From a paper:
Haloalkane dehalogenases (EC 3.8.1.5, HLDs) are a group of enzymes that catalyze the hydrolytic cleavage of a carbon–halogen bond in a range of halogenated organic compounds. Here we probe the structural organization of DhmeA, a subfamily III HLD‐like enzyme from the archaeon Haloferax mediterranei, by combining cryo‐electron microscopy (cryo‐EM) and x‐ray crystallography. A distinct catalytic pentad forms the active site of HLD enzymes: a nucleophile aspartic acid, a histidine base, a catalytic acid (aspartic or glutamic acid) and two halide stabilizing residues (two tryptophans or tryptophan + asparagine) (Janssen, 2004). We show that full‐length wild‐type DhmeA forms diverse quaternary structures, ranging from small oligomers to large supramolecular ring‐like assemblies of various sizes and symmetries.
The cryo‐EM data collected on optimized DhmeA sample showed particles with tentative threefold symmetry. Therefore, we have used a strategy addressing the issue of non‐uniform particle orientation distribution by combining data collected at different sample tilt (Tan et al., 2017). The cryo‐EM map reconstructed from the major class of the particles present in the data showed six DhmeA molecules arranged into a D3 assembly. We have tested both focused refinement and focused classification of a single DhmeA cryo‐EM density. None of the focused data refinement strategies led to improvement of model resolution which suggests that wild‐type DhmeA forms a highly dynamic assembly. No individual secondary structure elements were clearly defined in the cryo‐EM map, with the exception of a central eight‐stranded β‐sheet that could be unambiguously located. The structure is built from three DhmeA dimers, which are arranged around a 3‐fold symmetry axis. The dimerization interface seems to be tightly packed, while inter‐dimer contacts are less tight. We therefore deduce that the dimeric unit is a common building block of large assemblies formed by wild‐type DhmeA.
Numbering used by the authors:
A (entry chain B): 26 to 307
B (entry chain A): 26 to 306
The structure:
């Protein structure tokens, strides 16, 4: 009722993935690929997909271990493996020219794709992301340590902490977190919670990867971009917003008010125009 | 005994300033200008000046309302006015080609000089600075609100909070905060404490200025630079360190261990080589 969109599935060498694919299959137009955050599903972008659909092909991907995708028992939830999932997916769908849209963890993954394959990137839109090692922001660091490590995994697997508490925590307005959205995020089972439990640990251990991506920003600078930041966000500070603008040449920042971490769900109605303007301009 | 360096004074249109000026007066060599943080004096860089002196002319400036400088009763402690103090000072001393070194508040001020007059800047070294509006770092924001506003001013003027507590708070190793350093910082009088009390408020209200400087970074990018960051700092996060490196073309970051906010005092012995290498390269 809420998610009427056509759903499809790709078998990848590391496991099958679910995706949403709206708009024409006649790919004479640019494709936009959406990458979700944690513990979210591609459903996070239901509104964004709905409206962008009539102008651009819109594809949204569920990461392995999340959403409606396969969860190999040996999958390592390193950003490197998530990047490989995205890369193979883009090739499997024939998506030769793609604008990437990423949120939270999806930021660094879309960014990484663009670093490795800038040739196939038609532009980048990032929102409330985890790009760059986070060393100074004590809010995140304290949560990362609690939600990471052994205790992290146990908290996620035993209590679904990451969905029952942390998800609402990231909303400036929890009345927009509809029961259906809450159900689908909580629909993930106990085994799926392992991938979620690992995520913040992956950030703590992926600092070398994030640092490498930062160093390669001078090359990603040739790809047009937009950075969306909520005024009440927890994953990104205005200091970072300004620093990223200073480095990522040919980019622009957007500040959204009355919005937290989960921007596309609370303010999808503003995100749509921001993305459409980007897609129209370049 | 601790600060043997020759001291001089310039009358500026906004008040007189004190400065340290070491090395030859025969300016056939590059000059390095050091800008202090808060509530510090140019004494912060005594070690850095001592060693750089024999290779480069070293000048260190006390900001109006701080150190051994004049405190006009109408001085506005906006970064804009501090930048004008630095600009006029550089012109008054004939310092035609200057490498700027800034810490804390001195960061944005040296940076601003470079934005307005990149032509006179031989390079930039910044350490634990307040560049860019700070919106996400709740540690600073909570202190800014406490140390800023009316209560901020009262806390500084009545209790010298900013020197008795905040200064030691910024050290990873307080045993390096010698009694002489402690005395000189605390030597500032109650009226001088007003300038100090305003500082964090100036940051909260100067966000437009800091934002403008950030936007002009694409032009400052033509000036070689180094960014020094303490692993236990409170004014700057590694996220920012990485972002600044990404934007400031022709720059490099340095991470110092076992050091807090007041880097040149705790680890002056590492800062000297970092600055000398920059100046040699």
């Amino acid at each position: 009722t809420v998610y009427p969109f056509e759903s499809r599935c790709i078998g990848l060498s590391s496991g099958a993935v679910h995706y949403i694919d709206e708009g024409p299959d006649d790919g004479g137009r640019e494709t936009l690929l959406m990458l979700h955050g944690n513990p979210t599903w591609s459903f996070l972008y239901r509104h964004l997909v709905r409206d962008l659909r009539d102008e651009y092909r819109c594809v949204a991907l569920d990461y392995l271990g999340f959403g409606l995708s396969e969860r190999p028992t040996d999958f390592s939830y390193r950003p490197e493996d998530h990047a490989d999932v995205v890369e193979e997916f883009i090739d499997e769908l024939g998506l030769e020219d793609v604008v990437l849209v990423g949120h939270d963890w999806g930021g660094p993954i879309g960014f990484s794709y663009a670093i490795d394959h800038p040739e196939n990137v038609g532009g980048l839109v990032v929102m409330n992301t985890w790009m760059w090692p986070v060393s100074d922001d004590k809010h995140f660091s304290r949560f990362s340590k609690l939600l990471g490590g052994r205790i992290g995994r146990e908290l996620c697997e035993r209590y679904d902490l990451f969905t029952r508490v942390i998800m609402p925590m990231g909303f400036a307005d929890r009345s927009r977190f509809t029961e259906s959205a809450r159900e689908q995020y909580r629909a993930a089972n106990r085994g799926d919670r392992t991938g979620t439990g690992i995520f913040p640990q992956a950030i703590l251990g992926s600092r070398a990867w994030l640092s490498s991506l930062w160093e390669q920003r001078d090359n990603i600078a040739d790809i047009p971009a937009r950075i969306i930041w909520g005024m009440e966000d927890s994953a990104f500070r205005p200091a970072e917003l300004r620093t990223f603008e200073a480095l990522f040449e040919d980019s622009s920042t957007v500040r959204l008010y009355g919005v937290g971490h989960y921007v596309p769900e609370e303010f999808g109605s503003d995100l749509v125009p921001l993305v459409r303007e980007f897609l129209e301009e370049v």
